[PDB]
Amino acid sequence: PLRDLDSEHVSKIVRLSGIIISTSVLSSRATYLSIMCRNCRHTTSITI
């Protein structure tokens, strides 16, 4: 149950049931982003 979630479940897989109030709008997170230095013009890629 939702009320039995304790500090022993932190960073662990838990299975738990309930009802949904709200679904937020979709935010855009970055998976692969290409970056370039302002004046150095060094091109790099960060993958997430």
């Binding site: 149950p1 939702l2 009320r3 979630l5 479940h9 932190v10 960073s11 662990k12 897989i13 838990v14 299975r15 738990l16 049931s17 309930g18 009802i19 949904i20 109030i21 709200s22 679904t23 937020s24 709008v25 979709l26 935010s27 855009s28 997170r29 970055a30 998976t31 692969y32 982003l33 290409s34 970056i35 370039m36």
Partner: protein
């Protein structure tokens, strides 16, 4: 460089314990959840879900070292699926097609569909025939002048109390692919017909709800139709 970068979708969901099992004088507690990629836009607000996920921590800037818990969703299971136009499925497998074709050639098909309508209700065979006809409906027509002829059939059952008309409405609500059972004055907190209300956090007009609109392509069972 944005035209060479790749993005994914992320969504915040909010999960409460079910209001049936809550302490009497206490606030129902809730947690925020985050989902991404193909876990987004899979559940609508109001559905009952069991969710597997990582119970994790964030710090929000009440205690010197106090952290807000949240759930990183790894999977969502929908216990019950709501009935709507967008949630309706039109795909059929060949076995169901074959079973429906084999069913359609039964010469006593009308009799068995009338007997299947509320088998626990004694009598009212004509009412059950009417209910079968209402469930099928008629052909809708769109004409070159633009005006349309409706195919849906609206049936009124009025009579003495204790004649199982409410049970007929309940069974129609159960057997219809899309249905809602409401009163003449609506529901406890669901309106009848259509309600247009302002949006909560952006104050914009949107369709709040209503029995006649949520049950598009289906049946609205209006009990106590005279009080309205």
């Amino acid at each position: 460089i944005h035209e060479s970068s790749k993005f994914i979708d992320q969504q915040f969901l909010k999960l409460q314990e079910i209001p049936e099992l809550v302490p009497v004088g206490e606030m129902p507690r809730n947690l925020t959840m985050t989902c991404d990629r193909y876990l987004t836009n899979k559940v609508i607000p109001g559905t009952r879900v069991t969710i597997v996920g990582i119970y994790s921590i964030y710090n929000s800037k009440s205690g010197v070292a106090i952290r807000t818990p949240y759930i990183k969703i790894l999977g969502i299971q929908s216990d019950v699926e709501t009935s709507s136009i967008w949630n309706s499925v039109t795909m059929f497998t060949e076995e169901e097609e074959e079973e429906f074709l084999q069913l359609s050639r039964n010469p006593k098909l009308y009799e068995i569909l009338t007997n299947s309508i509320a088998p626990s209700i004694f009598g009212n065979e004509d009412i059950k025939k009417a209910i079968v006809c209402l469930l099928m409906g008629g052909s809708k027509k769109i004409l070159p002048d633009g005006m349309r002829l409706r195919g849906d059939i609206n049936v009124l059952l009025l009579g003495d109390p204790g004649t199982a008309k409410s049970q007929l409405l309940k069974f129609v609500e159960k057997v219809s692919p899309i249905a809602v059972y409401t009163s003449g004055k609506g529901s406890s907190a669901a309106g009848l017909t259509a309600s247009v209300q302002r949006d909560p956090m952006t104050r914009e007009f949107y369709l709040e709800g209503g029995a006649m609109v949520l049950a598009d392509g289906g049946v609205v069972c209006i009990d106590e139709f005279d009080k309205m």
